[PDB]
């Protein structure tokens, strides 16, 4: 439509190509998944567990916290070990002991190296084979492997059962003391752990890669990164460099240098409109954003104390009421809640201002219903997490209200349905402001159609957090989980907070509908080419095949290439301040939108491609260079956009309040300096020492308590505090600034 | 000096820091070199070879062609196998056979896998130990290893001695039939090969890395990329991305947008000066450049026929007179000669024009003496290579006049002394034109001091091609060799062909001494920060330690970072064409300087960092992704700069000759399209298949004749021709254009 027939058709073609690339390979993720075996049995014929016990153990694992206690297939928390690697290493060492007993009379560690090599070559014939019975439903594992599985079952039966022998192992893993009051639930959760470490051990039918693409790096069964893994890794590095260079070449040559130089108006154009009640009802939203932000930084500082200290916290223990999984669940979920609530507040700010300057019918009541629905969803979700991790809750009603166990979707399915209904109600309150400004027979729907499609994308695509039930397959709950963590949080918050920012900078008269639409459709098609099928860089090592990794390496090297080139759209945007005299009221939001760009190249670009290619992520998935990228990209991009929109909507609803520079200097350069201080001095060197240990000895070694208490990694995570107090001072100054602004 | 006290002191500090980094680590490359053992002996006490026989075999290996027949420690040609990996694999398989004989009565391939693992764990106790006797001079290797060495000695005694059993192995390796008419020289060259495959096999004193940093990827002795290898590789990738992004951030913000917009003069300022004899004597130089260029493309097409076909060439064989090593020696050396001669011609063009418009005293005679000295050096070097590879030369006088054996320095030491004396005579003829324009008491020495330092650097730094004699240590001949291939060819042709280009574009009045000096000292200090201590990415896997690799990964990620950002200085140096109406006479040089930039990001940036980091180069050093980078970076950067400086000096010595567009379109878009066609369709897919085979089975497997005749790699190098005829038509059109211009 309009004079944008090239850019709009490019955007639609990119959307269709990348969504066909998601659908055709999601069918494969669905059909090339590792089979949950119907009846596991020993070779003699005794009846071991089945797929019903494996899925009941999966539900029991979801009850204890799930991916907030430790990792499964690399995806989880990072204090407790990854259970599919720790179970694998303990089962392999039990098999090596039971193979050295009836062959040499000793253990594995007492034998000489030509005997240990002959035993490991016996390991790589039983574990890298003996898969399912080809739709026969049986497994039929060896009696030595049966005794090894039943021998390592006792370790996790004593680990989650308050045994005093495995005390000082639960303090190094930050687990609470009891952690499972039932005895059948542990006995089934070890069956679930065996299934996750059996899918990670046995090859496929016809290939030399396992079901998790050779993942948990184990030299005992010979788990090394495969051939096409390294091929697509070096192809992705070539694609990254020839993407950055060809993008700079095509920008410098194929550009239209018009230099129209549009003049800025002499008055702030959003102050000519009136203070309607739907604008004034956003003080509760801007209070909830910084309240959840202060709560989130406090819970982040509280879940970092279980890493340094044990489970005591300077006296009597509160780990029986607030364990590490609960405060980490809250520290993740309230982060997602305030980041979504800041963008919802910015949308509800822009929604009456699109439709002239007036509200639609029944708008303030809808804004109030939406605010109290969001507060009810937060409070009910946190009460459900507390009731599910403390096990004061029935396991029949654990998934619906309680804890889902998977990170970034930890809130229960009833509260997830409530959050999706609140997001659809915000979609209704957005379209009721946009559609009466598009139903008029005019020619004003140039950028507003892109904003309408972006609002529909951020509103409707939380429904992909369904299509996985309570006891369904784990690979399907790691394909539809990243549809709403990579495609919606990363992909459709960027596509909303850039086009709404372009609409704001266009309505102020600073950009003039040609750098607000051609530079906002090209900046929404460079990202949907590498962001929509880049979802597969989370599905490398979880039940998928080699072409999923092939798509997710190449089409995620192509989303770093418009992020490294962010000198433009960081100086372009920065200049806008030096274009009008009334822009000094918007100095501090326009500074955050500069820092948004900086942590969009350092957080998502440099540290996003450090862990991206499939031979680098192999030794990294589950280590401490993932919270580097997570803290630098979720707070540095979407946690400064939501604090830029908060201070922009603090203006034009409290227009007589100056932002008081001297406090906002602390609130900006405490957050930025603390984020750069707690990442570059504590998280990244720990992650690099873990990376050296994970490439040296194995994935089990980087997560084990013999390595995470190495007395150099004790002081290096004790050194979180010298960046953490700085981050807490910056976040506290931002909170006090917004509260003093709201009254 | 002048108003450039910041940039000049930055350049001097970068020079001093990177040259201290070269000196302090070159001392370590001198002292941490692998020892040539004084007396190799078996365990019983029989006297095997010594270091004198090893160095005489090194001289014998230099006599046959050296690094133009096959590789040693990764550095060499790519048709014949790498001899330190092929000797290593044959010695290991001979040891495995002689260890399976007296233990099971069978061979290695007939045993089951728990016996083969127990034999390989016996391999990694004798080969990864038993180094030198700690300044005792002895080696004292096992009698099983002695029989393995004497058993694999017969294979290379039959390989280089026209044996009919190893015929069709010499046609797959492109070696000529006889290749060594002596019998003691082969018997010592196998001792040299044993030393190169013994240094690459045994660990150091105290560490788990071998003397060549674990290099030839062999799962038998467990040669894998080490821990700090992978650590400094991922640190180099982070340094690359945070160099590109921070460079774009510091360019977009810390820039002075003055927009002075200097006007171009109405007449071409290099035509106001007169045609002196020192300008008119450059027709011989511009004839020699394109004569050696046509000869070089013909010899490249002739050394690519020994890869596809055997040693016959469509009838009776000329491999006895022109083998693969001789035509490859010529194809490399005449490439270096015409690339240096084009820059010498551009310097001799600029040298009288700096000193007003007049020649100094005795200038045309000096130009004629220099031209005939260069022609004598080319003819004497090629006759020496022909007499040394055919063995119609005494071995006492082989290194001085003959073949040095090391690639890019293949011409003999007498001819190398003659080439260095010609380069110093060109230094004299340059300074005789520059210094009388600097001895005047004025204020014109702004850019000319940088040009003087650059001309002194390109003149004096060929003397680092000395400091290695005839029989000196191979690691020292791989540290002082790359002082004049990486630091002088790559580092001081770029620092000469950019500052002379800035001087030319400043003399025309197109840039105005502020984009010709601030953009030429910043473009000469971004490159000397990653170019001067980046020399160590050629010294990873040749006798060096881990900190040499640590310097060469980090300080060579920092030389890709000003090469990927080449949209600027490719559009800045093309905008000019539209600046003046008389610029249409310089359309085709200014188009070549555009393509210079393009292959400076695709040839040196994308394909230069594809093979750069020490875990990627480990599986690549010696494969067919090195001629990708070599053909794209030596011709695409320094072979289009020397053809831009040829067609620029074709003007202003033949000013009445229009460059005839229609033929120059063929000469440009045949060279560019053939270089992009013979790289992306034949060399890079062969290199990627070899990379997959080198990460799968080993370094011996990627080079062996069982893999290079795999019938998919036969047609894929047979498909060189469909880009080769296009490159030949482009080079032929350039040759005919310059010859028709010169008369
Ligand atoms: C500007 C941006 C700066 C960002 C800094 C980034 C990286 C700096 C640290 C990177 C760590 C490199 C990996 C270190 C490593 O692998 O060393 C390991 C163990 O480390 C160890 O046992 C202790 C090694 C101590 C290294 C930690 C350095 C901390 C630096 C302070 C924070 C910057 C090898 O140690 P070994 O001698 O083999 O064994 C000793 C004990 N068995
Ligand atoms: C495993 C080890 C990993 C090592 C990899 C390399 C290290 C990774 C990255 C390190 C970067 C550390 C942070 C340095 C970036 C500094 C940019 C910055 O914050 O400056 C911003 C932008 O201003 C500006 O415009 C300044 C632009 C100049 C940029 C400086 C370069 C403003 O800073 P100000 O205090 O206001 O002014 C200072 C201007 N110099
Ligand atoms: C412009 C863009 C240009 C970018 C570069 C273009 C193409 C890069 C593709 C090269 C990657 C090939 C990797 C395939 C591979 O590793 O497989 C090899 C080759 O075998 C085989 O038989 C497979 C042969 C098929 C591969 C040929 C590649 C096609 C060439 C196309 C030229 C553009 C071995 O496969 P396997 O039999 O399974 O292994 C057993 C032997 N170890
Ligand atoms: C002083 C401030 C903070 C501290 C001390 C802190 C600390 C932590 C800790 C200890 C973890 C768990 C690491 C593990 O699993 O072992 C974590 C995870 C996480 N934090 Fe924070 N945090 C802080 C601020 C923030 C902020 C502002 C955000 C903004 C969105 C955030 C988002 C996250 C996320 C997404 C994770 C999950 C990472 C993952 O699971 O891989 N954090 N943080
Ligand atoms: C722009 C905003 C971005 C945000 C907010 C973001 C957020 C996150 C978070 C929170 C995680 C942690 C997942 C977990 O805890 O299991 C993650 C993982 C990951 N991110 Fe990003 N990301 C962003 C951009 C990128 C980009 C551009 C890349 C490009 C390659 C990338 C590469 C990765 C990879 C490979 C992982 C997998 C690590 C793992 O699963 O352990 N990210 N991302
Ligand atoms: C039709 C044109 C050409 C053809 C067919 C060709 C072919 C070849 C061949 C077959 C090799 C040997 C590969 C091996 O060692 O196995 C080679 C090496 C080389 N060629 Fe060319 N070439 C051509 C043009 C050029 C040009 C114009 C240059 C400009 C400087 C050049 C520079 C080199 C260099 C430096 C090497 C050595 C690479 C190394 O040793 O790693 N070639 N070329
Ligand atoms: C700009 C002009 C450049 C030229 C003319 C050039 C030339 C060459 C040549 C001819 C070789 C072959 C060496 C041999 O035959 O043994 C080589 C090797 C290599 N180049 Fe470059 N290069 C350039 C830039 C770069 C850059 C910027 C990098 C940055 C990382 C780089 C990385 C490498 C590496 C790692 C090797 C080692 C491959 C091996 O030794 O087998 N090159 N270069
Ligand atoms: C960017 C380039 C990154 C290069 C990383 C190379 C990946 O890692 C490399 O992969 C191959 C297989 O894929 C591994 O596996 C190789 O060695 C092991 C021995 O331990 C063998 O069992 C195996 O048959 C062999 O293929 C290597 O242990 C590893 O060196
Ligand atoms: C960019 C990201 C690159 C990531 C790719 C790393 C590939 C490294 O390849 C991997 O290197 C480590 C050593 O460093 C080897 O690991 C080895 O180390 C030690 C040797 O001291 C031994 O315990 C054992 O032989 C093995 O565990 C692996 O066998 C190899 O597969
Ligand atoms: Ca995580
Ligand atoms: Ca070479
Ligand atoms: Fe992602
Ligand atoms: Fe180099």
Numbering used by the authors:
A (entry chain A), B (entry chain B): 1 to 743
From the paper:
Quinol-dependent nitric oxide reductases (qNORs) are membrane-integrated, iron-containing enzymes of the denitrification pathway, which catalyze the reduction of nitric oxide (NO) to the major ozone destroying gas nitrous oxide (N2O). NORs catalyze the reduction of two molecules of nitric oxide (NO) to nitrous oxide (N2O), using two protons and two electrons to cleave the N─O bond and concurrent N─N bond formation: 2NO + 2H+ + 2e− → N2O + H2O. In contrast, qNORs are single subunit enzymes (NorZ), in which electrons are supplied by menaquinol. qNORs are found not only in denitrifying organisms but also in various pathogenic species, many of which lack the full denitrifying apparatus, bringing to attention the role of qNORs in detoxification. Cryo-EM structures unexpectedly revealed AxqNOR to be a dimer.
One of the mutants, Val495Ala, revealed an enhanced activity (by twofold) compared to wild type and was thus chosen for cryo-EM structure determination. A total of 227,000 particles were used in the final refinement (C2 symmetry), with a global resolution of 3.3 Å and a local resolution at 3.2 Å. The Val495Ala mutation appears to have increased conformational flexibility of Glu494. However, the overall structure of Val495Ala-BRIL is largely similar to that of the wild type, with some additional density between the dimer interface assigned as detergent molecules, which were used in solubilization [dodecyl maltoside (DDM)]. Density, which appeared to be phospholipid-like, was also seen near the dimer interface, with one phosphatidylethanolamine molecule providing an anchor between TMHII of one molecule and surrounding helices of the other molecule through Phe598 and Phe680. As a result of the improved resolution of the structure of the Val495Ala mutant, several new features could be resolved; most notably, a number of water molecules lining the polar channel from the cytoplasmic side to the binuclear site could be seen. A closer examination of a residue near the proposed proton entry site (Arg255) reveals a water molecule between Glu572 and Arg255, which may act as a proton entry point. A water molecule was found ligating the carboxyl group of Glu490 and Glu559 (the higher-resolution AxqNOR-Val495Ala structure provides clear density of Glu559), which is not the case in GsqNOR, as this water does not ligate to the equivalent residues Glu512 and Glu581. The significantly enhanced activity of Val495Ala is likely to arise from alleviating proton transfer as the rate-limiting step. This most likely results from increased conformational dynamics of Glu494, which shuttles the proton toward the catalytic pocket.
